[PDB]
Amino acid sequence: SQAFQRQLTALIGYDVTDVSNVHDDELEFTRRGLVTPRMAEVASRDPKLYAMHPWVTSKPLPEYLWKKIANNCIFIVIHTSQTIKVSPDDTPGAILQSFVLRVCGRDEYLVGETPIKNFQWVRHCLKNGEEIHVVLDTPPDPALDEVRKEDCDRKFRVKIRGIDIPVTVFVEANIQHGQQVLCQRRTSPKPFTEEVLWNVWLEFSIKIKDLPKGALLNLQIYCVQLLYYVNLLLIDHRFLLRRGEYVLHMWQIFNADKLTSATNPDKENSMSISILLDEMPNQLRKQLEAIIATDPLNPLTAEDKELLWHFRYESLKHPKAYPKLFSSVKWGQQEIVAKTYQLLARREVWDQSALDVGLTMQLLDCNFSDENVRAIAVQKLESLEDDDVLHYLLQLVQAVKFEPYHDSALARFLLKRGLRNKRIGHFLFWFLRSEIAQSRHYQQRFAVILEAYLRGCGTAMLHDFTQQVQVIEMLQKVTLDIKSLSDVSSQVISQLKQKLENLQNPESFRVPYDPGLKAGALAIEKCKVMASKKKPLWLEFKCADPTALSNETIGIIFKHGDDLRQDMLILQILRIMESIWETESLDLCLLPYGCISTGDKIGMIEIVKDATTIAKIQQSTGAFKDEVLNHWLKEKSPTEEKFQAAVERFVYSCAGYCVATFVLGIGDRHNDNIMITETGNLFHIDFGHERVPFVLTPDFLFVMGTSGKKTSPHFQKFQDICVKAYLALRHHTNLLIILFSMMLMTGMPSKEDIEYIRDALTVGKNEEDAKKYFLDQIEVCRDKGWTVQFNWFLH
Numbered sequence: 001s002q003a004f005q006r007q008l009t010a011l012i013g014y015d016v017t018d019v020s021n022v023h024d025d026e027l028e029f030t031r032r033g034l035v036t037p038r039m040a041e042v043a044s045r046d047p048k049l050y051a052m053h054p055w056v057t058s059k060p061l062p063e064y065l066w067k068k069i070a071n072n073c074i075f076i077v078i079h080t081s082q083t084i085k086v087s088p089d090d091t092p093g094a095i096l097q098s099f100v101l102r103v104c105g106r107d108e109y110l111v112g113e114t115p116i117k118n119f120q121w122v123r124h125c126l127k128n129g130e131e132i133h134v135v136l137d138t139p140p141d142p143a144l145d146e147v148r149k150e151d152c153d154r155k156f157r158v159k160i161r162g163i164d165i166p167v168t169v170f171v172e173a174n175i176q177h178g179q180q181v182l183c184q185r186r187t188s189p190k191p192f193t194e195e196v197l198w199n200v201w202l203e204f205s206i207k208i209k210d211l212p213k214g215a216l217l218n219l220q221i222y223c224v225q226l227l228y229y230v231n232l233l234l235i236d237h238r239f240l241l242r243r244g245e246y247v248l249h250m251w252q253i254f255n256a257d258k259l260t261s262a263t264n265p266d267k268e269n270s271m272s273i274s275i276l277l278d279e280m281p282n283q284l285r286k287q288l289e290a291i292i293a294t295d296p297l298n299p300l301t302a303e304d305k306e307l308l309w310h311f312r313y314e315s316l317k318h319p320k321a322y323p324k325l326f327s328s329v330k331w332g333q334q335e336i337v338a339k340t341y342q343l344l345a346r347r348e349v350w351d352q353s354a355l356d357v358g359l360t361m362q363l364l365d366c367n368f369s370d371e372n373v374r375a376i377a378v379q380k381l382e383s384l385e386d387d388d389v390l391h392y393l394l395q396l397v398q399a400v401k402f403e404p405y406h407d408s409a410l411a412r413f414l415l416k417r418g419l420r421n422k423r424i425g426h427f428l429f430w431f432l433r434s435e436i437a438q439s440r441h442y443q444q445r446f447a448v449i450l451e452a453y454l455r456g457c458g459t460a461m462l463h464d465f466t467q468q469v470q471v472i473e474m475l476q477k478v479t480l481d482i483k484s485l486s487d488v489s490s491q492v493i494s495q496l497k498q499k500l501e502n503l504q505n506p507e508s509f510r511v512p513y514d515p516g517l518k519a520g521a522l523a524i525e526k527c528k529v530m531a532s533k534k535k536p537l538w539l540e541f542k543c544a545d546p547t548a549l550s551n552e553t554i555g556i557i558f559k560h561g562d563d564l565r566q567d568m569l570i571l572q573i574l575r576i577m578e579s580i581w582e583t584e585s586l587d588l589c590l591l592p593y594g595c596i597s598t599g600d601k602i603g604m605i606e607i608v609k610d611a612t613t614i615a616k617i618q619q620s621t622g623a624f625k626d627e628v629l630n631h632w633l634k635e636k637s638p639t640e641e642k643f644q645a646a647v648e649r650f651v652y653s654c655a656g657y658c659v660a661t662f663v664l665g666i667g668d669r670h671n672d673n674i675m676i677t678e679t680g681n682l683f684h685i686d687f688g689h690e691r692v693p694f695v696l697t698p699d700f701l702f703v704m705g706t707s708g709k710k711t712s713p714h715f716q717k718f719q720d721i722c723v724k725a726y727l728a729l730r731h732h733t734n735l736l737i738i739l740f741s742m743m744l745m746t747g748m749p750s751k752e753d754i755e756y757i758r759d760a761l762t763v764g765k766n767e768e769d770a771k772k773y774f775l776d777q778i779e780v781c782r783d784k785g786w787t788v789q790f791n792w793f794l795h
């Protein structure tokens, strides 16, 4: 029967049928709309390849990795087991006749027409110098992917009737098109009582014909302080102007939440509003080019826009110009939007333009409501490969918040690519689910998209998702209860022990942050409760796969009290930073541990094996000491090779974070939050948690062979890597600025904050300046030594 809709609801965390919180039928129309994209991708997909999900690339194997193929040969261990020699560009389809190739312990298969070098797992191994273990296996049944069978010249105007609260005031109405205010009207102020009626007409100056699709009536209540906001889409999803009586429950108090077409579902408590609807000169060329060259966050003066619009067609031959050219369109004029479209009809240079993800992203941000503009960005995304889509997904998802309508190219794109690849499909799930679970502002839209995906991923995936949700809700329950019962107490660990007995009577589940890894039974004697302020559960599980090479059990932390959505975003940008460096033969040894937000200030975390905190390494002797980090680093490594590798790994990873963590503006971190692996790899944790640009303390320096006033061949390497790392990122200024900007608009608590990255990336500066800029930032750190780290102790 429809019991299927109940399980969907439970998977999704929201009931998409529930037609309570709607004043029109856009969500339903979208549920209906997304059926054919769902069905088309399901039909188009190859059952074999879809069943095995080969993680693959096209990108040229980086040089530093070819240095670990100094023989033109690669060792593979097939499983009693035997080693085999294989050429870099041999097919797994070929080396089978060398007498289905599945990775040991993992749900990862090596299949299809591509060199073995083009498989991510192979590239993962070479990076680490670990022998490729592959079980000789027969492919899983594609049958388990079974999908269940299913001309107006009048001026626009609005009647503000009044507002109502259950438990000095004026309404403001704005006709908005993507952050542009096309027109603005106010009501007369009135004493602020529970019910305040105006029954006024507000007549705008923008004529009805001049309303563009995607235009919001944004209603705001002021006391002067903004108190409550609400939005209604003036032109609706069927292409019809808004009409009729409307009662909208408003949100209580810049971020993506202010743009939503959703209404406050809390009717018991919320404020509501009743409304009623019934060829050029050298120099101008030089000025134009200087406009197009400016970073994405550099404001256009009115002189700029009139210029850009005038040389419209000449501006079109530059893709870098597109965000700027479409930010100069007067969307509140019918004749102009028309011209804009004759122009978009001949966007031929952009179609042939090599795909610029950074450029692409801009046309999807808060500043473009036109869906035809937004579509040309989505058009470029069509050519991205899976590996690429996986780098951008979290932020492509977040960009759905900026779409004016629930059904768009973007939402359809994420749907297609999720339906076409289990791994993308896996992450898409948890991303959407995380947003559905915690944003009242966007759950309705995100829930609809997630239904649309779950009704097409097939029964296997469906049952996969079932186990994970069951498990994470089971464990979440436990996570909160313990925080209620609290440094670490005595009963607490026994109380925990006893709770973990109750919830093992689902027996296997995919780790949400690494879908390749099966988590079997818990290891109940290994589970603890950490001594940090928020009392998170240290939990580990035995791997479900018997075909695993070892018994290194999977560790996952469960935490409530911090915004892991923020962690998630930072980490994604970290993976994008590695991705730039990789294309410039740079491995900065970033360790961006796996992490998913599952609810409100609550989620999960990848435990990185063989690592501790630098604060813990200091604790081991408030009176800090210089030597103990190098001392600790030695007493872990047996051989001199390993220690020399470890110290190098430190020099790269430290440079890596110093660059990353500086550019993102999260440099000034406490001791507790930086961690190092015994293998030398350093990494930061907790992003939901007299200044300094980045942590580079005298114990860090001591390891490089430096204290106070000194330098070493290993330290001069550090600066060499930094600078090179620093101007690598700078080559992708436009990309970074967008990602940063979108991360704030969709993930954090202002115009000011958005521009740290402009100062951090030093826009307008030449190359040799930036060299010196970062080198002097290194210098600043040497001075403060332990004063700032001591601050965080006092704090």
Ligand SMILES: CSc1nccc(-c2ccc3nc(NC(C)=O)sc3c2)n1
Residues within 6 Å of the ligand: 530, 532, 536, 557, 559, 567, 593, 605, 606, 607, 608, 609, 610, 611, 612, 685, 686, 687
């Ligand atoms: C507690 S709060 C927190 N918040 C964000 C992130 C984290 C985190 C991440 C990774 C991580 N790896 C660890 N490895 C070992 C061996 O202990 S511990 C740890 C902790 N913790």
